[PDB]
Paper text:
[name] (TV) has emerged as a crucial surrogate for HuNoVs due to its close resemblance in amino acid composition and the availability of a robust cell culture system. The structure of TV reveals the characteristic T = 3 icosahedral lattice comprising 90 dimers of the [name] [name]. [name] subunits further divide into two domains: the shell domain (S domain), constituting the inner spherical shell of the virus capsid, and the protruding domain (P domain), further divided into the P1 and P2 sub-domains. In this study, we introduce, through cryo-electron microscopy (cryo-EM), the structure of a specific TV variant (the 9-6-17 TV) that has notably lost its ability to bind to its receptor, B-type HBGA—a finding confirmed using an enzyme-linked immunosorbent assay (ELISA).
Author numbering:
A (entry chain C), D (entry chain C): 6 to 527
B (entry chain B): 20 to 527
C (entry chain A): 268 to 527
E (entry chain A): 135 to 267
């Protein structure tokens, strides 16, 4: 069908099925559960279906990739949580923003299941497909068939994918009119469910309901016992090699990450003899691991969720970590006092800043092979926020969290925590300096995330309401744990408030660029 | 096509009295109150531009009749007008929202609802019938209502025009639409038409600076946000904070004046404001007397910043030897007290009597204080529902009621010399007059025409329910002025997101 | 806003009791002294304390020499209207006014804050506004229809006496205003039916006690009163509410006993 | 109906009647005079029907306002002069300039009679109406009905109005393409006249024929006996408070304005005793008013059309007015001689510069209560063109002409007159200085205006032909008397020639802005 | 409907059941019947209170539904008081002393007692108890 615009211009509401539909008989299905007709009639936006194509996007890179599955339409996905088996295709719609002054083509091809998706103008046309002009636009209705060899799917079956790619780049220099694409779908008339079953499955919940709580209520994994004073963003902090604050939906807490940071914040050491030749006698001590009684590489080499300060790579007499320390005694501990301690030993690499039992202790009179408390508390010496930020190098094979960096153009938003500075009037020899701690992610959000497991291949785009809805920033939360925001400026000290009320916006693809922009320089 | 969901004529048999309407009301078409919004490339995707409800408010004729009637039924034939251009890129999807049903943030989900779409480029408006979804034979007053939600089916990719598009909605009750239960024409619902009496702003009063006529209107980018108390008013909540409908009466005040001296620098003496309105210093009622003062000259300036005041010892019959005296708020040397809202204040008089009421007339300001300093109202923190600090939506600036404050100098050694300054009042009770007279449609903004030269020049301002007016400004300047000729006039109801078509060049 | 005012303060000497000097009110609203526009600045004052009292009756005022930026030495000063010794000028509306200050500069603007009264002046004396005659369509004098009395907005004016020899001491008195702009607010908002008087109910004790008043289009409010008293007062609790449109001849069913 | 443009673009010739037509039976009409069919077929431009809408015009302000009456179409109006009663509607056409690159809507609503016309996008849609797009344009044919409660109108009946307003503002930044709107009309087939009557009525003549005469032939009311040396324009001369040169079509000559300025230029005074304390003894004198023998406020306080120089507000020994003066004697006057005279007295305000009998006279030996001639002649002292321009302040209740200022953007064009300077070689004590006089309007034009009374609510747009048609300026003549031109520059000394040949262009609304522009700076 | 005091004949006004719903449950919002003095007693020659009684009867269409056991929290239309002399009643202020008589005193303008106070809705108020003894 075709229609003219308000005046001039021409827009086509194309409908076609690039690949024929082979409706299954559902004979093997024990019971073919029907479905509400108004669901077929109604259309919904596919998760991650909103991809924007500008004149800068390279031609050939795929912008959208959807598995033909009940997850496409919200209603069908929610029902699929009720049922067990599903069948039938989907009527996907491509809503395009056509102006008749733009110039370019997009191509939508249905990739069969178990077939790799290529990304190039060439080499992608082979698949059954359709080409949409940007000047025509308006709702190319793709009848995405249900490519099947079994009569109806069970959970986990590999599924065909619809992929949209820039067929011909946008070039019309009408002053950078980007084209936004919305994709919607709904079950085809042939779609049917089967085998009703209690509604608890592995489905990612179609909408993840964010508990309306503020960040300052959240705990700081790297700095428990310290409220999250504000959310924070820095350009310099490219990567994050932390092991205490790191959680993911799939693998759970990683490395030293724990869901009770305050609970595990404490640790103990055996205080083995010997010391390095530093001006203050730094007696060695080995952290005792309740979970690793038999020291082996596959488990962590330090107590779960112990410490992540990692002040200096070669910190000698300039930087230190300060901690309460007391000798274990009947009941509790003996005269617990603050002391300047360090990871491993400065004298040797691989131990200067790593994760191992061996650690410096300021206490000159540290008893040989006596259990000693250690509370990392804070930092002293010449440390600063960035020196704290760099976590110690973790090595071995103890499933430690790999260091990660945000996608180009985005930056890691952190849960900034203000660390009080403890200073002694008497000559205890130790004076913690004011410092701050940044946490990649807090377990509180991750709890609701685990409840509403992310849909595979999608990314939680959470918009952060700050001033009662007047100001709404947008942070992209990745399933790996880190949260990122699209930033244009280049500043290290830019701040975000801690008003709260995180809310779920929609499911977007990792490549998706946040429409909202945070000017760090501003 | 035109009707995504066919209307279900209700038999109304349950209605005690079927109140028909003039057929010509159905025949005629007209724009709807508040059904005006601006869509622009700067708009955020997935953000509902506008939300309505199938209700007699859609048609102004139907609303006017609704003031007479208690019950009503039927949908609304709605026609959507687009101020589009050829360069425009995008489509609009309007999805009728049955009551109790939530609205998805995505157009791909809005498509499921009974909807209908046009193109920005096409000129002929599209007609969408928005049926009334009823679970009862007819609809009483105050019940939940199905919503009409307009969403940009496609945002502005080309954006070659780079100027927003105006949308206006027209509605018509369906032939099946019927009223019932005739009642006296007095309803809490907002009147479709707001009639603003012609009163020049100078004819209005300045809450911040009584006794000084509003000399002009002011615009300033520097004054990004408003934290004032006296000026603020609200259509719904009435007066907020210290603000009162009589700034003149509340201007006077007094303090018990306990015999105490300043601690950091004992050149001043401490006095506590009595609270006739608040019998006891409660954390919920205002800490300062109703409508007293919000100069906030000093932030930490113990001496350089000072407020003037006519002060006198209280005696039988009246006060004593009322003389100018310079004063401050709380403890200048104290954090949380140098500039806050509480009883303690500075007093210049070296001699202050132990617990004697002193007249307090804030009068004016002294020292190095300036307009910028006074514009910053004292920071007040507590649990007495202080008036919240507000700022205009991005792209719009506050318009204030500028007032001129005369200076006062003394040759004799009274030690007080009031520096000349200006004052800015957020809103006027004289405009709240007609505001309260005619209610605001919920979640809608009044668009006011301000006429200066007998109609030759008009400035359009948005007046929000919160009580603050804004103007679209392309430029950025600090000292921009607007005359006080007057003749405020109501234009239309617009959504808060609406952008004023007219623009004001501040750099001019 | 109109309360403040200024006078050119020309070099004129008082007659009768010396030590006072004449001053002319400047007319920012009225550029030039005209027989049609008001002779005094808009909304200046109408105290009219004295009728022929050269010294017994007087008005207080905060006055200061006008200079760049602002006024100078704003101090209380005793003042009056026109020529207290002159018939047709003692109590009228003309730029000429008494000034207590012995030192008045030749043609310098002075701040004029009418503030309050002084001397023998009392509430009755202030209640009599100065007689104004001319062609400037001054507000006509009005009286209530027989059997009804005006209801006024009483206000309290604090006194002020000085220990230092400033020579000015304000006597405490009250003030009565015929109508309030805060009520004319809604009056203008909703016009009056032609030739009809609004009958409004005034509620004092949360509805326990009500008082019916008529609000005439001329601005004055009246109440039917069987008794006759001078000092009768009514609480200011509030809650004015419109009852019904009535003809001017209407007699309020409710009655207020003044002797009570 | 619809039609495409030369290529692309789309234009609609809409026809519709927003309000139904109720044709009267004309039963009560004694005789229903028919009307020439070709008049119905033919279309004409309505007076004031050419209103231009640009992207700067505020949305909401009404641009056009036409009473549905025979005055709309020229032919019908001229016939209506022949007849007595009229009936029937009109087919109004909206000719729009649509480009398909513009963007905006205008709204035309038929206001019923005796109903106030509002001006706002909202609050105006209630009336029966139609919305025209600027991209479609081309002749929306509005069938303006004849809203009647009487079967056929008599003269003076209130009539419904068609009002056109900016429904949606023009914004298309195609480099300031303003849109010009022409409105034309013609009687509907039902239109009929009745009761033929001799053709002399109160109708404004449909076209006002300007007598082809030059300004220098015109007289200068403020300075008779002095030819109008040129037409003149000044930025500084904002308002005009003159009482000698002021005429209007409706109320006739106002204040001291007279149709024989030269005839009344003379006056006489009684020369009452007393003088002010100025260095030269300025004897007082009271002007005798033939029309005001009993001095009363309602009539003027000075002789009709006496004097308007008004040199100085506080002119003492620096400025004066000079006039021939002679003592009345048997026959004529005794030794009439020039003398420096003044309005009222400098010593007092309200008399310094006002209109009253009392006036200064230079003559030291001015006889008490002796009639004396006064001929204002010219000016002396330190006067200049602008000091002369300011007329004296007029006060009282003698129906004096109110001071007026032009609409914003326009300026008062004047009839500049060059005043010869009389200088005495002998010590007569008086020396007139060269000066000029500006006149708001001359009675000569107003004579033809009275003949062709202006249509109510319209303004005479007269184009001034100067160089034989090569140069044609445009001056808007308001019925109040003043003539104005749209000026862009800001200069006080800009001049217009006195070639002549004023010609009538068309009837425009007061809000109308002259298309032609005069650059004062140029 | 409007009635005049002077007339003795009763005026019948039908009080319709305004329903936005098929039928009412217990506790729903209901249309109110309001009686107001249309014109005041300006004459006041009587100066005595005029008593008003209201009588009602269900309209023919009036109908019930959903039979249920007869127990509801609503107040009974008729209140039955056992015949008990006040001296047979107990005095909270002074137990052990029978209520000798009922007392009126103009001087006792207001009551500030705690023990005596009782409330139908709130039961005992302040120190008051159902067993003063």
């Amino acid at each position: 069908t075709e229609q003219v615009t308000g005046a001039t211009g021409i827009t086509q509401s194309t409908v076609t099925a690039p690949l024929p539909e082979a409706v299954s008989s559902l004979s093997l299905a024990p019971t073919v559960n029907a479905l509400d007709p108004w669901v077929y009639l109604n259309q919904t936006e596919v998760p991650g279906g909103t991809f924007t194509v500008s004149s800068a996007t390279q031609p050939g890179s795929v912008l959208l990739e959807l598995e033909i599955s009940p997850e496409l339409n919200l209603y069908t996905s929610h029902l699929f949580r009720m049922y067990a088996g599903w069948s039938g295709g989907f009527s996907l719609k491509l809503l395009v923003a056509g102006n008749a002054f733009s110039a370019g083509k997009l191509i939508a091809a249905i990739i069969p299941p178990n077939i790799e998706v290529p990304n190039s103008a060439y080499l992608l046309t082979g698949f059954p497909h359709e080409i949409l002009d940007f000047r025509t636009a308006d709702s190319m209705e793709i009848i995405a068939p249900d490519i099947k060899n079994i009569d109806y799917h069970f959970r986990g079956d590999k599924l065909g994918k619809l992929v949209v790619m820039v067929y011909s780049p946008l070039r019309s220099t009408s002053a950078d009119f980007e084209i936004e694409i919305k994709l919607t779908s709904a079950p085809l008339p042939d779609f049917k469910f089967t085998m009703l079953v209690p509604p608890i499955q592995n489905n990612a919940l179609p909408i993840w309901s964010i508990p309306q709580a503020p960040p300052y209520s959240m705990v700081n994994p790297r700095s428990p016992l310290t409220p999250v004073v504000e959310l924070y963003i820095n350009s310099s902090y490219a990567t994050c090699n932390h092991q205490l604050g790191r959680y993911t939906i799939y693998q759970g807490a990683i490395g030293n990450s724990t869901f009770n940071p305050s609970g595990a914040w404490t640790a103990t050491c055996t205080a083995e003899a010997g010391s390095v030749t530093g001006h203050p006698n730094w007696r060695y001590a080995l952290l005792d691991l309740p979970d690793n009684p038999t020291f082996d590489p596959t488990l962590p080499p330090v107590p779960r969720g112990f410490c992540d300060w990692g002040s200096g790579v070669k910190s000698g007499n300039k930087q230190h970590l300060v901690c309460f320390t007391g000798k274990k005694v009947e009941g509790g501990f003996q005269d617990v006092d603050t002391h300047m301690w360090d990871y491993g030993d400065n004298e040797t690499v691989g131990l200067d800043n790593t994760y191992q039992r061996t650690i410096y202790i300021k206490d000159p009179s540290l008893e040989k092979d006596a259990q000693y408390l250690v509370i990392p508390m804070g930092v002293s010496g010449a440390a600063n926020d960035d020196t704290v930020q760099v976590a110690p190098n973790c090595y071995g094979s103890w499933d430690y969290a790999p260091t990660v960096a945000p996608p180009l153009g985005e930056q890691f938003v952190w849960f900034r925590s203000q660390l009080p500075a403890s200073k002694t009037t008497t000559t205890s020899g130790v004076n913690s300096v004011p410092v701050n701690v940044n946490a990649l992610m807090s377990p509180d959000l991750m709890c609701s995330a685990y409840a509403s497991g992310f849909p595979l291949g999608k990314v939680a785009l959470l918009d952060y309401v700050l001033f009662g809805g007047s100001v709404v920033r947008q942070f992209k939360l990745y399933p790996e744990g880190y949260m990122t925001a699209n930033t244009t400026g280049s500043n290290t000290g830019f701040i975000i408030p801690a008003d709260g009320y995180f809310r779920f916006n929609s499911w977007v693809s990792p490549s998706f660029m946040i429409s909202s922009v945070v000017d760090l320089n501003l």
